[PDB]
Design a protein around this ligand. Structure first.
Ligand SMILES: Nc1ncnc2c1ncn2[C@@H]1O[C@H](COP(=O)(O)OP(=O)(O)OP(=O)(O)O)[C@@H](O)[C@H]1O
Ligand SMILES: Nc1ncnc2c1ncn2[C@@H]1O[C@H](COP(=O)(O)OP(=O)(O)OP(=O)(O)O)[C@@H](O)[C@H]1O
Lengths: 638, 325, 293, 325
């Protein structure tokens, strides 16, 4: 902290000189204490689980404020990156390197990372002794925040200070941190010397898992790290893999089996309304049935649109502070003794903020595949629940046996399967459709902050690329209908060739080789030209990506010619915007035909939603008409 | 194919449905004693260093709180002399903990805060140095290693002695040091079904040592054979020679206990012999050979067995044949 | 394990057509580097503006037609060659050894191989060649944009080698079991439609209800395996590709300040870093579709 | 309602009419070892400080008796240098006891009284530092904690096996570490009256382990059931199923003993099952399940029992019904 005479200056003034370098040194001791206590407990649990441990099979426990503990562990990461970022600028000033200026931020990252290992060691073994050592830290860290604020008020800037912004963010964590420490299930106090919660130790999930070969429990780190290391270890083993890849159903423990049932039961509850059954009624009951995960996974998809959309903005800053700033060479103009909030888009902050764009890109792909995951689980519970009430409904009803007298009920079974999985596949990316126009509008808006004519070029390119996509794909779908009919004729000649194997040698060889090869070349010729139309639409799709390429060239060319300026911005950045557009274009038209198939599938679902004494008994083939049998009377003794 | 315990020992079992891991965490000493040497050294080296840094930060703080280190005022006397750098405080902290007493850094009577702190530094650093002495000693007394020198044969044998069918197992010692009051317990672990319809997965039934007195143990200097007389209470009474080795998939465990003549600790050596690990018809070759000075025992013959003419009938049939005779 | 597939529907014309598609994509990355170098020319401030913006649109329609030319009419020669050569290669066989064989595997593998391979082979094939061509194309392009010290390709293909190996194994197993799980459900659906009066006869109709729930339960668990596959696929591939983006940021750091930074191609490693992770994503899943297909 | 020992252990008893407390006071080590950690640290911290002050007062006295500290005479050499304040003597005293050897305070050859005192300070302060090492070690070896991992079931069962009524209790282990030569003793504590008119409040009569050999203990890795065959010597021979659970207010204690494979110390785990804690008609559900690698044991089934058809008669009546048959 000393360059020439700073230590002496600090020493002269009373009260640690209003904490010049002392406010920073004060923060460090608690972090060291929190890290020096930890190694003994962390290391031991690292060794006892490596040589001889029995808790290597099934162990899990929950604590009140789990989601607020992770959210505070993630937000303290963003605040630790930020403190250091500001810290780097102060160090550079290029006069003297003050070591005690950026140290409090580097201690914290290790400490907060050590706090996450304490939560994992506590989630394994339930004891309040750890929450008391953390509380001892949260309180000492709370008191150090006050000094910085206290020091700062006298030395007030307002909003022009970057040290303050970091401190302010940090202060909220301490406030948030108290609730975690206020758990009622902790028996470390003198009061309530017994266990306040006796039903907490036994978990429903563990019991699911204890008899489970593969637990597959959602109540985990939520990082998709253990869901892959359990399957993965077996896959890595060579002897294990052969066994695993064969008896996988047996290997599967059918864990979510206790949760599939709830969804079937939940569907019935949703249906239970005051109004009669309706296509709309079953639709909005189904949306009411899913409950949290629809708008929840949609909200995670919108957060993925938030992190994903910006992606390019960080990149421009590099071309400006690096490329355009050719001979700037001026680090600061404010009070150089401290950090200031202005010019936060520095050159180094463009680097670490670009790595922050990589970390937020992991947040965007992670939350993207997370909402994808909850969508797939939602469709799994969807087809399971609607399958349950479906076959329970037709198994219980036994109504209108006249249409059941025909084979149309079997068509209702096959179309119930293809339309049911077509309906879950219709629901498969519904938050992606909900979050597609927000990404198109926001990306088109940032494209409008770039220029106008490029937005006209690319937006017109997608605006023409969508009707060729779903219309040409609809032509390929009719090609799949007629080609499916001719391929069904190939199946009829194929089982007719099985009849040729049932027939003689010479007669079936000549007449079935000639007739089956000629008719199979006929229907395979019509489906060959249909295959040429379908591959032509696939080439239409192939051509479509150069439509975007053409727009990029016409965008930079015409948008260059209408204006009177040149920049390396819109090439790299606006090319990036174009990449974003492709996923939402064909996914948008695919979501449109998915919506048409969704309304058709819900329409077909609503269409499906419709010893002995005998005295004077009347029987019918059809209740709409007069009984077929009248006044039938007989009794049979046992 | 399914096994219970290895031919060397330490049978591994899988546990499901644990209630609390907190009790295990609370019970620190046993785990510490159990852990291997590389980690053990790591625990004591880091915990010491982790402490040395804590006593150094608060010492760099008492000089920063007084502030006498950078201005260099001649009238203002420092609470500790020669503290010029940040590192020096850490060096001083090491000094007090290990009682090196270098002499360069001297403590004065100016600050009544650091002197009470110095006492807290010394008592806790004297306490962990003492706690470490008792933990390392406990590992210096582990007697698993003594138990290894206790060797068991490759296979087992079953031949009739004195007119009665017996099961033979041989054990030996490779040391000049002995084991006191070492009792041996053999159990037959098979899955039995009761007449009421209950299936116990692994039932453990004990078999007699056949000592006339009512034996528990025997003085072991040279390789001795243990014999299991098949009577009406023995489960192997209804077993045939060529039919029992493949048809049945059971195991018999050997439990050798005892204490060391050097250390009070009592150790245990275990092994198991399968249906294919047992031989019928042969016997254990005589290891003891008498020389001019003493009796010598060759261990290459320990895993050698010779076949002799024995009956191909079961013990129920053998006692039945002798009760009819 | 593609030497059997290399003789399918010809070798020479497919090799020249897909070779011309690879040359057309090399012309596409030539349009990329020409737009990047002319972007450096605009950053140095037209001079060659007619040459740049006119010459930079040559391989657009050429890449669109030539890149889709290898599988343009390949379904015709694969259709008559595979269908006629297969139906003749099984038609000229004697009827005794074909008569002593189960017809379900022969007609199932035969007809499902013809419709499934003839319908779905060229889409994932051309998507696989496009994905791998773009992946190695921008991979070596942004790799040369980095200095030789800033390549660091050995950890990338190390962790990527781990991912493609063990995800190839477990993904083949997961698509195998989840693919095989579907048919018995529809089998007892046909049995459910047939024995409806037997369900009236079976006084305990809940037996097929709970057994039914075990079947759809097993397919639901298999669906959770599918989401596990896409989960670790997308998260692992985008995670390691994000590490490649951070290494790209290190390359832009050293190439930016450590020496004379170029007038362009600074953000080319960044856009090609995010799209490099996209290339690892569609390259991994395209490797999966090429594995099953 | 009246209990003898808890379902966890450590049965509390009230003692009246004590003769002397002096013997207990005299026996210091056991009490010290027994006391919890917070007080234990307090005893060693205060006793050290209490000593440090005694060695400091007599050192502030040898300087006060010589008087060389305040006048500052240059010819008169002090018995110990740099003694300016009262606190300094205490600091010096700490130095000698912990052997810090700072170097600021030096001792001379002027006063033959303080040098012999310095020897008395060092030998007693070296003695309590050594005595503390042996007391802390003894607490590092307490094996009550190892005994906790020894779990007993919630309730007990009584069903006939092989045609004879038996009482079943199951015990398990949660560790990878074992217990050697661990003998189990079960006692029935009921208030019996003799034919002469004497009422003993709590009579302890032992029940057989039913081991065929004459068993004391069994190798415990997985949960095993202990069985109590009701014969003519068993007190439960004259008991009915629905009448014995409420009418009688007695208890049966479980005494599990044994030694640790890590430490020589032998521990004991105890529990008791009341008249309402015993179940008639059901049995213990099979915990052991065989897998590909090893045999797994689920502990959620440990407290689960299933009912099977059993006779509603007493053992005297059951043997009477079979002796008439
Ligand atoms: N109040 C007490 N508490 C515990 N132990 C006692 C008490 N009083 C005596 N004892 C001890 O218990 C033993 C019981 O015998 P008894 O109570 O008859 O003692 P005593 O014959 O009175 O002889 P003494 O005077 O030594 O107790 C005595 O030998 C004595 O040592
Ligand atoms: N998951 C577990 N793993 C190991 N031990 C357990 C577990 N659950 C309970 N125990 C202990 O084992 C004993 C077995 O009895 P049981 O399993 O019936 O417990 P319980 O009747 O549910 O009472 P508790 O709620 O205390 O477990 C219990 O007394 C308990 O202390």
């Amino acid at each position: 902290c000393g360059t020439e005479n700073h230590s002496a200056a600090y020493r002269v003034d009373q009260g640690v000189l209003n904490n010049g370098c002392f406010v920073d040194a004060l923060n460090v001791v608690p972090h060291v204490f929190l890290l020096f206590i930890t190694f003994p407990i962390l290391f031991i649990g690292w060794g006892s689980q490596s040589s001889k441990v029995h808790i290597h099979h099934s162990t899990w426990l929950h604590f009140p404020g789990h989601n607020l503990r992770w959210i505070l562990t993630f937000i303290l990461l963003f605040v630790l990156v930020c403190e250091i970022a500001e810290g780097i600028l102060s160090d550079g000033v290029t006069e003297s390197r003050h070591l005690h200026l950026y140290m409090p931020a580097g201690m914290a990252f290790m400490a907060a990372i050590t706090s996450v290992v304490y939560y994992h060691n506590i989630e394994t073994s339930n004891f309040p002794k750890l929450l008391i050592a953390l509380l001892i830290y949260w309180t000492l860290a709370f008191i150090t925040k006050t000094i910085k604020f206290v020091k700062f008020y006298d030395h007030a800037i307002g909003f022009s200070q970057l040290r303050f912004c970091l401190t302010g963010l940090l202060v909220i964590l301490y406030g948030m941190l108290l609730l975690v420490e206020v758990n009622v299930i902790r028996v470390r106090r003198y009061i309530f010397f017994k266990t306040p919660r006796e039903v907490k130790p036994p978990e429903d999930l563990q019991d699911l898992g204890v008899r489970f070969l593969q637990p597959f429990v959602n109540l985990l780190s939520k990082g998709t790290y253990w869901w892959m290391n359990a399957f993965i270890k077996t896959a890595h083993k060579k002897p294990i893999d052969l066994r695993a890849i064969a008896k996988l159903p047996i290997a599967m423990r059918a864990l979510t089996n206790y949760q599939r049932l709830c969804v079937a039961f939940d569907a019935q509850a949703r249906k239970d309304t005051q109004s009669p059954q309706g296509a709309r009624a079953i639709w909005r009951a189904l949306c009411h049935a899913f409950g949290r995960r629809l708008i929840l996974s949609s909200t995670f998809r919108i957060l993925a649109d938030l992190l994903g959309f910006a992606g390019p903005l960080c990149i421009f800053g590099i071309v400006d502070h690096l490329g355009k700033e050719n001979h700037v060479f001026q680090p600061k103009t404010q009070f150089l003794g401290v950090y200031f909030v202005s010019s936060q888009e520095f050159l180094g902050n463009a680097y670490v903020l670009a790595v922050l764009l990589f970390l937020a890109l992991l947040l965007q792909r992670t939350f993207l595949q997370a909402s994808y995951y909850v969508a797939i689980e939602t469709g799994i519970n969807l087809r399971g629940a609607i399958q349950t009430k479906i076959y329970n409904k037709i198994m219980h009803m036994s109504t209108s046996n006249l249409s059941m007298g025909e084979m149309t009920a079997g068509q209702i079974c096959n179309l119930v399967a293809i339309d049911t999985n077509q309906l879950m596949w219709f629901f498969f990316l519904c938050p992606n459709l909900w979050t597609m126009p927000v990404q198109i509008i926001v990306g088109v808006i940032l494209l409008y902050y770039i220029l106008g004519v490029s937005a006209l070029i690319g937006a017109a390119v997608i605006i023409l690329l969508a009707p060729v996509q779903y219309f040409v794909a609809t032509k390929l779908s009719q090609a799949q209908r007629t080609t499916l009919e001719h391929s069904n004729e190939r199946l009829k000649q194929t089982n007719e060739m099985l009849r040729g194997m049932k027939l003689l040698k010479l007669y079936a060889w000549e007449s079935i080789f000639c007739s089956r090869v000629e008719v199979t070349r006929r229907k395979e010729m019509t489906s060959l030209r249909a295959f040429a139309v379908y591959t032509s639409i696939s080439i239409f799709m192939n051509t479509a990506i150069p439509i975007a390429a053409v727009l990029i060239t016409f965008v930079g060319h015409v948008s260059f010619f209408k204006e009177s300026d040149l920049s390396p911005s819109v090439a790299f950045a606006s090319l990036s915007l174009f990449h974003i557009l492709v996923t939402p274009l064909f996914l948008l038209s695919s979501v449109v035909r998915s919506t048409v198939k969704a309304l058709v599938s819900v329409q077909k679902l609503s269409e499906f939603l419709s010893c002995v004494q005998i005295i004077g008994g009347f029987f019918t083939w059809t209740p709409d008409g007069i009984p077929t049998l009248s006044n039938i009377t007989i009794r049979i003794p046992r | 194919r399914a096994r219970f315990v290895s031919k060397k020992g330490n049978c591994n079992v899988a546990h499901k449905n644990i209630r609390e891991q907190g009790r295990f965490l609370q019970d620190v000493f046993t785990t510490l004693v159990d852990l291997k040497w590389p980690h053990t050294l790591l625990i004591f080296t880091m915990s010491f260093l982790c402490s040395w840094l804590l006593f150094a930060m608060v010492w760099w703080l008492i000089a920063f709180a007084h502030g006498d280190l950078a201005p260099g005022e001649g009238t203002n006397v420092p609470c500790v002399t020669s503290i010029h750098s940040f590192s020096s405080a850490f060096l001083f902290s090491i000094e007090v903990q290990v009682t090196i007493g270098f002499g360069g850094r001297m403590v004065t009577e100016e600050c009544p805060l650091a002197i009470l702190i110095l006492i807290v530094q010394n008592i806790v650093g004297l306490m962990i140095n003492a706690i470490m002495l008792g933990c390392i000693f406990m590992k210096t007394a582990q007697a698993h290693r003594r138990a290894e020198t206790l060797i068991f044969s490759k296979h087992a044998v079953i031949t009739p002695r004195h007119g009665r069918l017996c099961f033979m197992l041989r054990v030996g010692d490779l040391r000049k040091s002995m084991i006191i009051s070492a009792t041996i317990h053999m159990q037959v672990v098979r899955k039995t079904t009761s007449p009421e319809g209950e299936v116990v997965p692994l039932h453990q039934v004990d078999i007699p040592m056949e000592n006339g007195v009512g034996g528990n143990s025997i003085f072991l200097v040279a390789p001795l054979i243990i014999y299991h007389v098949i009577d009406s209470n023995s489960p192997l009474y209804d077993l045939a020679p060529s039919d029992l080795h493949h048809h049945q998939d059971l195991e018999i465990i050997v439990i050798l206990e005892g204490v060391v003549e050097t250390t009070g600790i009592t150790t245990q050596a275990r092994t198991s012999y399968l249906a294919d690990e047992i031989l019928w018809g042969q016997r254990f070759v005589p290891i003891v050979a008498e020389e001019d000075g003493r009796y010598s025992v060759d261990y290459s013959k320990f895993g050698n067995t010779v076949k002799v003419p024995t009956p191909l009938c079961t013990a129920r049939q053998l006692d039945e044949d002798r009760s009819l005779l | 394990a593609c030497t059997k597939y290399l003789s399918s529907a010809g070798i020479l014309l497919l090799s020249l057509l897909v070779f011309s598609q690879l040359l057309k994509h090399m012309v596409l990355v030539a349009i990329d580097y020409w737009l990047a170098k002319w972007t450096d020319s605009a950053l140095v401030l037209q001079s060659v503006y007619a040459m740049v913006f006119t010459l930079l649109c040559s391989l657009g329609i050429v890449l669109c037609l030539v890149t889709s030319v290898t599988v343009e009419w390949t379904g015709l020669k694969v259709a008559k060659r595979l269908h006629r050569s297969l139906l003749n290669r099984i038609i000229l066989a004697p009827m005794r050894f074909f008569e002593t064989t189960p017809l379900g595997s022969i007609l199932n593998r035969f007809s499902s191989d013809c419709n499934t391979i003839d319908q779905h082979i060229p889409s994932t094939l051309e998507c696989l060649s496009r994905s791998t061509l773009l992946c190695v194309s921008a991979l070596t392009v942004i790799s040369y944009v980095t200095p030789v010290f800033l390549v660091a390709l050995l950890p990338l293909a190390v962790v990527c080698y781990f991912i493609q190996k063990y995800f190839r194994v477990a993904s083949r197993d997961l698509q195998q079991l989840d693919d095989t799980t579907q048919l018995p459900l529809v089998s007892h659906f046909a049995e459910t439609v047939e024995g409806l009066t037997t369900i009236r006869a079976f006084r305990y109709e809940a037996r097929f209800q709970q057994k039914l729930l075990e079947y759809t339960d097993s397919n639901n668990i298999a669906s959770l395996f599918l989401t596990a596959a896409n989960r670790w696929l997308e998260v692992c591939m985008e995670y390691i590709g994000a590490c490649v983006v951070l290494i790209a940021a290190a390359t832009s750091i050293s190439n930016s300040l450590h020496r004379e930074l170029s007038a362009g191609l600074v953000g080319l490693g960044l856009t090609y870093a995010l799209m490099v992770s996209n290339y690892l994503n569609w390259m991994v899943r395209n490797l999966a579709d090429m594995e099953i297909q």
